[PDB]
Design brief:
Radius of gyration: 19 Å
Protein name: Pectate lyase A
Number of strands: 30
Subcellular location: Secreted
Cofactor: Ca(2+)
CATH superfamily: Single-stranded right-handed beta-helix, Pectin lyase-like
Structural class: mainly beta
Pfam families: Pectate_lyase_4 (PF00544)
Disulfide bonds: 298-326
């Protein structure tokens, strides 16, 4: 097929981990026969089967991963909804309505997957039709919007939007006196994955959001990996976990967080969650949390089994913050790439808001 989106040939920016120890170029080097334009699930997987071949897959309209047939059970959903992205792929949205629904975009590096670029597309979080019951922990949903696992590396998420969509948590029903939880995390990055850059993206309206380093026992595999750079993104109405990281080395700068500690549906808990052996370097970020007094600024960065967190020139409700008294060790590791962290202002944050997410490339 032909190439419509001209920016489809782009590679991740010099800035970020996805450009360290190798470049992320997706299917740029795709041959004309590896340049598709899918409009439905059949075509989508049909193209994706080019496997490790350089490919440019253009999304036109909404792709209903369910193919119109709702999932009968867990098996069914597992079987059909987990769409895999093969190495050297560039999934780019066309125009403003590039959307995916009833599924999960999986970047599983078990078969060597690497060098992926999901760009300019909306992914509405999937609804698990058969949540497991962890007695004492109640109902638990299974699928995310996008999962990067099993060593996957050199992935670039840009102008992507992950949201709950037409089905938000306040629409949950209740099964056996418990709340039928049908949403898992929005974006996951686990089991050895590395070199990831998320930019100009929007995660809006969701509970458990981004979990990096799924388990704090997996250490050995996760140790010294999971380098994620997040900049110019917007986390709006997300309950917890901008990055909630174990082992990882998160670089979140010039991002826009906006929520409300008393929201009716997604109550702000924190943004950065420093987990076991995790480290986060926050800079020039904008934290606009309704109902959050400056005298409680440390609510934005919560501890777990970690401590390495450093922030620079970020703001809470339009004014400089000081997380220094929150009790964290300094981020001593170096950032290999060169970068310009712009001084966060109302203009900037306002600007970042306008250009974050799909349909705005």
């Amino acid at each position: 097929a032909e190439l419509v989106s001209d920016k489809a040939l782009e590679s991740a920016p010099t800035v970020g981990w996805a450009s360290q120890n190798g470049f992320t170029t997706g299917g740029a080097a795709a041959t004309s026969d590896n340049i598709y334009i899918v409009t439905n699930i059949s075509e989508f997987t049909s193209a994706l089967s080019a496997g490790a071949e350089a490919k440019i897959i253009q999304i036109k309209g909404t792709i209903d991963i369910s193919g119109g047939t709702p999932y009968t059970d867990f098996a069914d959903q597992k079987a059909r909804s987990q769409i895999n992205i093969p190495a050297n792929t560039t999934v780019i949205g066309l125009g403003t309505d590039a959307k995916f629904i009833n599924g999960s975009l999986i970047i599983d590096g078990t078969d060597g997957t690497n060098n992926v670029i999901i760009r300019n597309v909306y992914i509405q979080t999937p609804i698990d039709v058969e949540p497991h019951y962890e007695k004492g922990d109640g109902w638990n949903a299974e699928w995310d919007a996008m999962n990067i696992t099993n060593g996957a590396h050199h992935v670039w998420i840009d102008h992507v939007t992950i949201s709950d969509g037409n089905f938000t948590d306040d629409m949950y029903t209740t099964k056996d006196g418990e709340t039928y939880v049908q949403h898992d995390g929005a974006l996951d990055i686990k089991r050895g994955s590395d070199y990831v850059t998320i930019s100009n993206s929007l995660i809006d309206q969701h509970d458990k959001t981004m979990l990096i380093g799924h388990s704090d026992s997996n250490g050995s595999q996760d140790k010294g990996k999971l380098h994620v750079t997040l900049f110019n993104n917007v986390f709006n109405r997300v309950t917890e976990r901008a990055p909630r990281v174990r082992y990882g080395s998160i670089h979140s700068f010039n991002n826009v967080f906006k929520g409300d500690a008393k929201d009716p549906v997604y109550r702000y808990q924190y943004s950065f969650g420093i987990g076991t052996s995790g480290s986060v370097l926050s800079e020039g970020n904008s934290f606009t949390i309704a109902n959050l007094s400056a005298s409680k600024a440390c609510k934005v960065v919560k501890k777990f089994n970690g401590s390495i967190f450093s922030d620079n020139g970020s703001v809470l409700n339009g004014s400089a913050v000081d997380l220094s008294g929150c009790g964290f060790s300094a981020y001593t590791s170096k950032i290999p790439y060169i970068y310009d962290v712009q001084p966060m202002t109302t203009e900037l944050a306002q600007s970042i808001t306008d250009n974050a997410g799909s349909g705005k490339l």
